[PDB]
Amino acid sequence: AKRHRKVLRDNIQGITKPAIRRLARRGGVKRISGLIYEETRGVLKVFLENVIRDAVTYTEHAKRKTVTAMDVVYALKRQGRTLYGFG
């Protein structure tokens, strides 16, 4: 069976409990429930899907196999989340 690498922990589980706790602290919350740790992961995954979709559209229009920071900036500005400091 050890021919097959045992399936790794899911990538969305890489946003650990302490990381979400730190984000919530910077947001200014004191107490935190136990289901936020999955609701937040879902929200982050959805946001990332949208931005990645737009960035990939740009980078394949440009005839390149390389997503670039300036494409990410274009995608964010398209969504209406302009970001200063990268282009």
């Binding site: 069976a1 050890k2 021919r3 097959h4 690498r5």
Partner: protein
Amino acid sequence: HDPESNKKRYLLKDANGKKFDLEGTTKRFEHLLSLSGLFKHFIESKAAKDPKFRQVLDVLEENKESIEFQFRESPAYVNGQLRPYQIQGVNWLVSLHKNKIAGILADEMGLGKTLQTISFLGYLRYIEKIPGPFLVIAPKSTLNNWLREINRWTPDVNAFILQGDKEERAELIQKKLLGCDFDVVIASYEIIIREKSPLKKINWEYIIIDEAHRIKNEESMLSQVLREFTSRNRLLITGTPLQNNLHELWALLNFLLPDIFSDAQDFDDWFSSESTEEDQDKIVKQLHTVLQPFLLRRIKSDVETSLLPKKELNLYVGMSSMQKKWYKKILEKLLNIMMQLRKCCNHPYLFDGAEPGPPYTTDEHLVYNAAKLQVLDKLLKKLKEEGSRVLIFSQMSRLLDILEDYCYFRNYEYCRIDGSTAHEDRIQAIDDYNAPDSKKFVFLLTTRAGGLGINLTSADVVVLYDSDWNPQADLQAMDRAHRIGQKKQVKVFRLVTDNSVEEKILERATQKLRLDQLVIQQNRT
């Protein structure tokens, strides 16, 4: 001495102790130009921008003590007697010092290495009467080995290892380093990067760096840090100089003598960029004499005899059907690199979905979907009668997983060492396999793993089930069983896949190996 005498001398007397010294560089230029005249190329190359070296050239040219203390058979200060060629090496080192230059020691591994080093340090302390400091940079696995060697063949010195956690290292530094209560400071690479600032503010005599081949890239952080260190001279220890290129030899030389080999372009235009006629031949290769004084290498065929040689063979396997379909799929189009070609040449099941089903089974069908593995199975079956234990190497541990599951499918007894197995279980594993009667037929390993202290000397056959870009890594894997120790004939079987990229990898490896052959080995003497 006492700590205050060490404090009055060790610490940098000035704020900026790094400055151009003229006497030493003039001495080096006069001695080397006396040795040979090819160096004018380097000197004119370095004088193009800065002309004070050009006035050094002028003054040393227009005007046209390294006492021969042979330092014979082992003096009493180093306990016991030792190999006469080691006395020859120590004489080499002494003359090197007395000519105000440095030089790589390139003795083959296991040929009494670091013993000439400690003897030379004792010579410095007793015949030259000079105390420390002496920085020693070695891989972590050899720190205690170095310390034991120093403390058991020249015990009347000060030497400690600079290892530990953050706080233990800090207190040790403030106690001894800033305390100036040492003669030799054993430290590891990572420690050298970590403890940069305290170690800078010491007037170093030498900086001994074992396995010097680690410093072969001049953008490496360790190389930058060692350049930033102040020292009087240097000393390099490594068994495989010029592993896979000619430029890295210049990279070693630059750290050795930063005032001689100060230009990369000059050295890479010395021989490399000229291939039309005999100008790529005898004359240009005999221009190697520039490398003659800076290096010494000795072979296991000059010294201990024993160890019958090697019997390297090649087993040109043929592509298998599933391998064929995967290889054609890869060639024309997850997969993002040519490394997929080598993966396919090794075993198709590395790619996901290659196992049929999957219902998870480990039956005889494994060797069916593999070219090399069938030859491997037949080879193991043939060797089982003579009971010769096996060391299998590879480039991917993920391949070793398939191989070990094959291993226990046919009811064999293996034992692994990879990047994930810790130190203590590694040690118990090597003890188990090297037992006087060990019931573990095969042993698995990764080519670039385990360091150098591994002593898998109990077996006789070593299959390089995959090849490597650097032939030196494969050579280390081979001498891992061919070192002093094993006395039966060591047999090595590389497996090569035809009509595939493995031919190209082998061919480039042969280029680099023969380049190493022509550059160093004949002029090794």
